[PDB]
Each structure stands twice: as structure tokens, then as C-alpha cells.
Amino acid sequence: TRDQNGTWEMESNENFEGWMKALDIDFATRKIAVRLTQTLVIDQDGDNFKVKSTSTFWNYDVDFTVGVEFDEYTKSLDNRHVKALVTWEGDVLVCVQKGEKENRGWKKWIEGDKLYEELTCGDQVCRQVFKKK
Ligand SMILES: *C/C=C(\C)c1ccc(-c2ccc(N(C)C)cc2)s1
Structure with a gap:
């Protein structure tokens, strides 16, 4: 399914700090942010x-x-200019x-009743899983 509508609550987070470091996010921000549960809302x-x-x-x-x-x-996030494109x-x-x-961007897909995503930058990949609220 291509339908990603919903309020998505994080279940799993892997290598979020590696992705942030590849973006050169500063130490203090990374150390706080890596601890946190995320929500993704998609309309x-x-x-x-x-x-x-x-x-x-x-x-x-x-x-x-x-x-x-x-x-x-x-x-x-990192105060940079990019040319962005989202496709299927x-x-x-x-x-x-x-x-x-x-190698900067992300991928999202529905797998079971969950939203999976990859955040990528440089040679780093962060992998996340969210459950639909
Ligand atoms: C589709 C998923 C997107 C656009 C994102 C997932 C995580 C994001 C993010 C993480 C951390 C920050 N800050 C300000 C530390 C901003 C965005 S965007």
C-alpha cells in the first residue's frame, strides 16, 4: 500500500545518533535528541x-x-539548502x-500495520519503526 496517512508513534530507533552526526549536528543536541521517543504525523x-x-x-x-x-x-535540523524530490x-x-x-534523504514504507523508515546521510543509515496510533 502507498497509503501512509496517520499519526505514527515510534516503536524502535536504530543509529539515530549516527545519522545526526553525519549531518554535523552538535554534541549537546545529539546527546539529548538520541534519548527521545518520536512521533510522525502524515497527511x-x-x-x-x-x-x-x-x-x-x-x-x-x-x-x-x-x-x-x-x-x-x-x-x-542542520540549516542547509538542498534540492529535494520525493517519488515512489x-x-x-x-x-x-x-x-x-x-546519500542524503529518507525512505518510508508500510510493512504490516507499521510504518518503517530509513534516514540516510553519508555512509550512515538510521532505521525506525512506528505503530499507527
Ligand atoms: C519523513 C521523515 C522525516 C522528514 C524526518 C524524520 C526525522 C526528522 C528530524 C529529526 C530531528 C530533527 N531535529 C530538529 C533534531 C528534525 C527532524 S525529519
Whole structure:
């Protein structure tokens, strides 16, 4: 299924700190952030997505249209400019962020009743699993 709508509550988090370090996020921010449970809220209507990543320490939102390139500032994550594109590879939602960092982006897919995602930067991969609330 390509339907990723919902409020998703984190069940599992692996190598979140490696991903943050590959983005050069500072020590203090990483050490606090790696401890935290995350929520992902996805509003999906056709190609149009609104995605919100939250914890007690951040609230990061992005809107996009599948298949439409968009210039993006990554704001309080790592304050960089990238050229972003989100597309479907089968039922995997794939984001590529072109810019200073190699292999930067993410992948999301539904597997069972859960949302799985990969966050990638450089040679680091963070793997997460969320349950639908
Ligand atoms: C589809 C998933 C997305 C866009 C994200 C998953 C995690 C994100 C994130 C983590 C940490 C921060 N800060 C500010 C530490 C921001 C966003 S976005």
C-alpha cells in the first residue's frame, strides 16, 4: 500500500545518533535528541503530503508534492539548502535531498500495520519503526 496517512508513534530507533552526526549536528543536541521517543504525523491526499516529525525537543514540518522538485532549507535540523524530490519506487516513498551531503534523504514504507523508515546521510543509515496510533 502507498497509503501512509496517520499519526505514527515510534516503536524502535536504530543509529539515530549516527545519522545526526553525519549531518554535523552538535554534541549537546545529539546527546539529548538520541534519548527521545518520536512521533510522525502524515497527511496524505493524492500527491500532496504534509509531514511532521516531533519529540519533546523538536517539531519539524515539511510539505511536498510527489514528483515535484522543491528547494528546501532544512531549518533547525542542520540549516542547509538542498534540492529535494520525493517519488515512489513501488510502494516505497523515497526522498533525495541534493546538496553538500552525499546519500542524503529518507525512505518510508508500510510493512504490516507499521510504518518503517530509513534516514540516510553519508555512509550512515538510521532505521525506525512506528505503530499507527
Ligand atoms: C519523513 C521523515 C522525516 C522528514 C524526518 C524524520 C526525522 C526528522 C528530524 C529529526 C530531528 C530533527 N531535529 C530538529 C533534531 C528534525 C527532524 S525529519
